[PDB]
Amino acid sequence: AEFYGLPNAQEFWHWTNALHFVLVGLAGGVALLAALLHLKGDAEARRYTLYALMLIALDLFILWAESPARFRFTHIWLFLSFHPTSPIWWGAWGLGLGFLTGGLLYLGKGSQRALAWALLVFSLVALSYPGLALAVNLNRPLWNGLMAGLFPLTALVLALGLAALLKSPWALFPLRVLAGASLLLALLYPLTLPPEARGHLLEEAGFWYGLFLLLGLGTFWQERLAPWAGLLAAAGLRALLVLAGQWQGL
Amino acid sequence: AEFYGLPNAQEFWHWTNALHFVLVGLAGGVALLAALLHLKGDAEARRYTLYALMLIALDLFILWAESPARFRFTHIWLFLSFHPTSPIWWGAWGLGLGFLTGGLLYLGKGSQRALAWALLVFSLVALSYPGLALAVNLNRPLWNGLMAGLFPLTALVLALGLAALLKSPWALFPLRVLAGASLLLALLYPLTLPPEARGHLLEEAGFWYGLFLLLGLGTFWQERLAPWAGLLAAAGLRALLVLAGQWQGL
Amino acid sequence: MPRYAMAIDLSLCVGCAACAVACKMENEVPPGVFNLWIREREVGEYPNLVVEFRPEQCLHCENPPCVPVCPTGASYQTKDGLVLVDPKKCIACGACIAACPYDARYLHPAGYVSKCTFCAHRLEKGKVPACVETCPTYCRTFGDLEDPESPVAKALKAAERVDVLRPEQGTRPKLFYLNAPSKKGLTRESEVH
Amino acid sequence: MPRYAMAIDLSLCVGCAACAVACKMENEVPPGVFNLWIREREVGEYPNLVVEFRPEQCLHCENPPCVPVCPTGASYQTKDGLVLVDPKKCIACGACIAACPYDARYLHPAGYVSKCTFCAHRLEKGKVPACVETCPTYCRTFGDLEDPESPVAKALKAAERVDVLRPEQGTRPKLFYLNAPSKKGLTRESEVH
Amino acid sequence: APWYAQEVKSVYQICEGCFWRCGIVAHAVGNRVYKVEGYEANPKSRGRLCPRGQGAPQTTYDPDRLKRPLIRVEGSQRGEGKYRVATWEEALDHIAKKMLEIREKYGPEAIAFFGHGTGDYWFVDFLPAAWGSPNAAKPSVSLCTAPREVASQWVFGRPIGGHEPIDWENARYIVLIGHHIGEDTHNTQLQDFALALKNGAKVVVVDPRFSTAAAKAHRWLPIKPGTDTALLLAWIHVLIYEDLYDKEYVAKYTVGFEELKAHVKDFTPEWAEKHTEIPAQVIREVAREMAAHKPRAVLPPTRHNVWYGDDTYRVMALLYVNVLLGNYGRPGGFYIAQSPYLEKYPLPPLPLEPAAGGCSGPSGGDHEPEGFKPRADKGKFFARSTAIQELIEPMITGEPYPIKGLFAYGINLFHSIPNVPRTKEALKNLDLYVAIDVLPQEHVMWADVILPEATYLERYDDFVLVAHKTPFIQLRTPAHEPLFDTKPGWWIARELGLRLGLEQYFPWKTIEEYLETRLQSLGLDLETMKGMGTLVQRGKPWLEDWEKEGRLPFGTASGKIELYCQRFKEAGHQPLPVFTPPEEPPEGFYRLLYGRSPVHTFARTQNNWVLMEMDPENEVWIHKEEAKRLGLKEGDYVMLVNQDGVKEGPVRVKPTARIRKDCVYIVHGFGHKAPLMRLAHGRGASDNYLQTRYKLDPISGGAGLRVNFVRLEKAERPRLPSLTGLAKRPFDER
């Protein structure tokens, strides 16, 4: 209760690393739309493959921009070591091989639709890694097993929300299905925590939490409200869980 | 290591109950289908309601026929008290009231959209209670937070898989989206566990687990294998987590 | 008004299941189940060899996870700190078994769930529990935690160390272990092999 | 080939912060961050007042959660049991800070993660750490766990009791608190509120 | 539904759980004892009870418990299990008719009487002497206590007794030699040992195994087996040569102390460390520490002492160390135990009377010209006690005359006497073999005539007298009437006694008639005795109380420290030099050590469902590093094979270290081959079936058992019935 000096219990991932969490949701979700649109033969497979390349690149810039190690150029090691136990390592390659693969597909060369199978795999790795980068830390009570489920569900709500605003006929229905799955697990999450962890969550966020749950109920009303209301709900929850879970707590 | 007498650490939920677990998934998810159908004003809303009633009856009958207190007639207390903190209490009221609500819908008595929204809310209570009946036991390392995510998504793969065998046209696309979600979260599940618990799941099960993960991949292949494969993966996964997770273990 | 508890001195316990047999007899606990058992574990090599003898049974937790999870209201906590079951409401659903972190409860063959009762039948008529009375070594003590004179209160006051099983669940057990033999504390299966 | 460890006898720690200041001077640790800090907590009520003075720092865990989590490989565990950071490969991502259960890690203002180092720079020239050297009360000891002539080894043997922070976690902390002042062991914030 | 809410009837009753005979209260509801409890005034229980005492009542409510007399079908072999139901009248006639025939062509000494338990007074002490046979014996003499009783009679003039006389409450330093307290679960001594620890009593344990009592010790000396007399001689040497002994005490109460100092000259802590394997510094430190605490330092003598052939020497040496410390009769470790006063029932003297020997000719003087035929083991060892294991040979060869006919009153022929094959040959050759018991064990079903006894809760027994600090008398009253066709032992004895001309002995027409006569003597009657279950009398415990009266206790007027002028003379040696290096295990083998389970009594509790459910099998203890070289792990099973090829049923392996690499250990009493005791049949390994050989103590009739070696052979897990299934069979009094 009293200290000489202080434990290093200060926030470590700030509002900027909560912004990247939202964009890699989009980047991975759209890369999934693109490969599936390929595999299916669809006329739109190209439009969506060059978007995913921009979203992926925007994120990889924000990832270096926000790193205090940027002008020391140490990121080359992310690609020169084998580290399978590391969620973040798996996301460096998943977004890197996912880029090259999406390049060799947009420049119609190298190879066709055997390459859409590789884009499908790399997009699943990019959709899976954040969720596990949090849940892997068993010392953080709030970041439980549900993070590995709440993040991939929520990244597809972001990709289908974007797709529906660029008026693609197919996007609305699956966005309202994954948005229902997303919102129901988000409601059950608090009931899954021990009493002290839940109490911490309701005093720190919540309103904010219960706001984004209510806001998300807007995907099931009108259009041009729908993709917006589901998009703000998915990014709310994603940013708030990264911000409120950096607690170690007894 | 050695005992005089023994601790009561034996299996409390049998193959009998794991069956109840696969069934309440079907029951709840078909009651969601009947609700959403009455809500679009679609013609099939009538017979889906008969089925959700049948599966609700079949599930209450085996919950009672498997109870050690089946002839002591004490289940009446489930209905004469208020226990909001208990998943099994929530489950008894959701199914029960969901069976009256769906009873009046079938008999065109006591209103009709205001009864379809009710069936919607009671079918969300019944889809939600199983994963929480597991997940609230924070002493059992395998029943972590993801159980609140794995159980709702898997009850949907069961209902939609059934709807597609009965040849309903709308369901073979939602069945593939929801089966992709369930199999992705099921694959990341073991990676969400402390080392010793993952090692315990792998020794006691897995090979069954890994077989259920492959199986479910046939939901994206040949048209009429797709519902069988999706049904067996979702039911195998539910029963395996119920039998293998009854461990306190240090 | 009292807050009921039990204290066992492990420095005196020799693991002769006397208490375990006395409870079996006094409470008519059927053959395949037990309210009380003894665990025995050795720790270490030649020149530092310790043996821990440990009786285990309902700890009558102050914050019992075995109560809120019950659908009917059969599972309940008393005003003095006793955790009990009203068999008249019990549906034998096993929710309380899933929730107890100590393997303290079982399905009795009469169709309802059972477990250590702190000998509520003897407590009500002013007697001490069966385990406490039959005990050659005098290592168990019982009483009101709030009375400075009671045998448990005294036992805790005179102890060199005090421990409780799985303290990190947050159940607040009311069965206290005194003077554990090993320097590192109560023995766990995880600190083996 | 040895197993490096630190032991702190809490029956002698008075929480003066000498070790903490000796560390800051030696490793020129920058303002606002600490390799070592002291925690002081009272367990209360008059006839029975207890104060725990507890120095905290990297425990150089034997099964460190901060190593596996690193994408670069800058977080490595040595052949004798020191957890260190090679700043040449560090991308300052914080994954290790997220996985450390003890708040022992910080972002250095020069753009890489830092923490106590078991005074690696002194261990190679055959010297004892700076905090161990300055200690007025003779309460901290160091050495190879496997060599029985070691000052850690002899102290572990002489201790009345041995404890570690968050044992329930996977880690196997290699910083041992010896004679804890409260009978219930090391003080926790949940045991207050 | 609960028993305590239902109507109850209590009674003051003795526990027949084992021979400690604790005073208990039994709570019955109708024809069934639901609970039993200790009681405060009683000096043995004082309110507490061990596990065996608590579970003891279920044998009375066991569906396999023996109910009717039975006679062996004519023409069927003993062993084969063919019987036909009989009447008490018919079975009792058949026995007397047969007994009388053996007596007309051989004499009455051709009938051996073996027995154990409370009613052994009738079968082993009374009936045999009234009939005229000196061949009466119990296993608690040559298979237990003989070595120490003989050592004690020679050194002091007194026994050690059934309730060993240790002043535990004032003891300050205690040394246990093989004495396992906490596994051996005798009530009062568990209580006392626990109270000593509690008051700051530091305990040293000497044992090749890290036992329960060692788990409570300040020092554990892991001694090489069969080597204790070398450690005792070297401690005797340190107290005499470093001049630490109690000088006065030896000067006023000790004869021949000089012979001892010279004998022990070369037995030094360095000579001891060589055979013992305990470092010389440790041997020295332990003797100094015990000298620093006198007279409040004690080496209490253990109960089971047959270990090796030399045994009386080891105990004599342990007793010298106690004498040298000045503790006998002083508060610290030995109080002086006097027997209570309860006058015998008036009768004519018995044809044969006993000789509680110790000095001046207690061997065969009355056996040579004195009337007609001496106990059949008369020339085999020095001491005068009857040895159960030596009178078995006379039944096979007819050597010392012939013993046709044998009685077994509650004594396990196949588990308590070594060399089971030899005992089976001997039953083959008999003209008559009767067994009185309750359960259908493996040795009861080899009998011509089986008689079902009534159990301790359905029976009255002659009083139980206990020598003690405060001598006392106990009385057991039925809690309810016998079940089925069951009869008490006092009744069975009298009924046989009237049939063989012994009416002057057995005159009284009933046991309460008998009990009223002894209560007249003391100043009470039957109803008042039932009122205060136990009776405490005045006696004495120190030396002052004796001394001020102008007397001392003993044998001959001063404890003789070397200890016995008449053995010296005609036997050979006086002192305990027989440290006699022990024969060692052959390579590939281990010494077979054995002992008690806190929850099971000897062999008789293996069919008890309340107790088998706490401990369903035994487990073999091997050092962690040996089970590893062999290819054995935690849940494996194994067969134990002895140096003579005998195999003992599959046993679980226990690879946890608390034992030397020289040895292996198993609890005694498992391995039953008795199909009719449905839950004890086929479980664990029997130590007795592996104890094929034994080294005869030439001084105290004892059969040294720890002389057998065993090796382990990988076996399959056993397939057995479910214990819960069997335990659930309902009890029907028909």
Ligand SMILES: Nc1nc2c(c(=O)[nH]1)N[C@H]1C(S)=C(S)[C@@H](COP(=O)(O)OP(=O)(O)OC[C@H]3O[C@@H](n4cnc5c(=O)[nH]c(N)nc54)[C@H](O)[C@@H]3O)O[C@H]1N2
């Ligand atoms: N191999 C080996 N032999 C030993 C020992 C050992 O450790 N190993 N220990 C030795 C020692 S120390 C002792 S003291 C002796 C004890 O030896 P025993 O007393 O012979 O041992 P138990 O195995 O209990 O056998 C008791 C027998 O009496 C029967 N019985 C029990 N209660 C009653 C009753 O009320 N009435 C009647 N009629 N019968 C009853 C039981 O069914 C059983 O047949 O054995 C000695 N023998």
Ligand SMILES: Nc1nc2c(c(=O)[nH]1)N[C@H]1C(S)=C(S)[C@@H](COP(=O)(O)OP(=O)(O)OC[C@H]3O[C@@H](n4cnc5c(=O)[nH]c(N)nc54)[C@H](O)[C@@H]3O)O[C@H]1N2
């Ligand atoms: N639960 C229970 N308790 C009982 C009984 C029962 O049947 N059940 N029976 C009672 C009776 S009648 C008796 S006689 C006793 C028997 O019990 P004890 O009288 O205590 O027998 P001991 O043979 O002295 O002790 C057994 C110990 O002796 C050890 N030992 C073996 N060889 C040697 C050696 O060479 N040197 C040394 N120092 N130790 C050695 C073994 O390792 C074991 O740890 O217990 C009595 N109490």
Ligand code: SF4
């Ligand atoms: S009765 Fe006493 S010695 Fe026996 S198990 Fe219980 S606490 Fe331990």
Ligand code: SF4
């Ligand atoms: S088994 Fe009985 S006591 Fe336990 S939760 Fe169910 S109804 Fe309640």
Ligand code: SF4
């Ligand atoms: S020990 Fe078991 S029965 Fe008692 S409060 Fe805790 S969980 Fe409930």
Ligand code: SF4
């Ligand atoms: S207190 Fe009651 S329930 Fe607990 S062990 Fe004793 S008799 Fe059994």
Ligand code: SF4
């Ligand atoms: S030198 Fe000792 S007393 Fe001072 S802060 Fe360091 S550990 Fe605490």
Ligand code: SF4
């Ligand atoms: S901050 Fe540096 S040491 Fe820590 S995980 Fe990232 S790269 Fe590894």
Ligand code: SF4
């Ligand atoms: S205390 Fe934390 S930072 Fe230090 S080695 Fe252990 S897990 Fe890593």
Ligand code: SF4
């Ligand atoms: S070992 Fe070195 S770096 Fe660690 S706290 Fe001590 S002085 Fe600081």
Ligand code: SF4
């Ligand atoms: S010591 Fe135990 S088993 Fe023996 S008579 Fe006494 S209570 Fe019964």
Ligand SMILES: [Mo]
């Ligand atoms: Mo004995």
